[PDB]
């Protein structure tokens, strides 16, 4: 959720395309093996068309959440039954965009926050000088 | 604990409070005088 992957060489060897796209998804650390596209491939070694195919097989699915070329598309990881989700990947200027949460954004902003809150909180209480006559005063 | 520290501070000016509140013949002289205007014009002079 955290890191970027970008193979800009990918894009050289190939061109950066639609179908391109899904296998530069493939091609990224973010990608698993132990999905369907890669027994899909393997099986071919030995796009409609392809989600036509994904309805026959069961397992894990990675499918095309949108095209804006030649630039952006979401990339949706689902789990099919209906048919769940999982996570949803950006594909924006030839790099793979981690889904990063909901939850944990949230998490990294009231952890920003916190924290200078306390530096400041810190550094301005070590200033005042108090005499019960004067209560606090700053010297 | 700031909070706890602050209600300290707020005794010790409770207890200035109260501090503050609990701080905030004849004939002698006529023969003294006698003499005394005696001496001092020097009148005498003889």
């Known amino acids: 959720d955290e890191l970027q992957w970008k193979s800009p060489e990918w894009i050289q060897v190939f061109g ?107 550094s301005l209480y070590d200033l005042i000088e108090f005499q019960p006559s004067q209560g606090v005063h700053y010297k | 604990t700031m909070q706890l520290i602050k209600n300290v501070q707020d005794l010790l000016i409770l207890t200035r409070s109260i501090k503050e509140k609990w701080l905030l013949d004849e004939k002698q002289i006529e023969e003294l005088l006698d003499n005394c205007i005696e001496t001092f014009v020097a009148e005498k002079t003889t």
């Open chain 1, 16 to 122: 950066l395309r639609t179908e391109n796209v899904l296998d530069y998804f493939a091609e990224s650390p973010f990608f698993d093996k132990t999905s369907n596209n890669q027994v899909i491939k393997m099986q071919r070694q030995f796009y409609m068309q392809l989600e036509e195919e994904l309805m026959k097989l069961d397992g894990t699915e990675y499918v095309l959440s949108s095209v804006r070329e030649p630039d952006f598309w979401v990339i949706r990881k689902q789990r099919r039954t209906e048919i769940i989700p999982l996570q949803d990947y950006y594909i924006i200027g030839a790099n793979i965009y981690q889904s990063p949460t909901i939850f944990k954004i949230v998490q990294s902003r009231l952890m920003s926050t916190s924290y200078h809150l306390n530096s400041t909180l810190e």
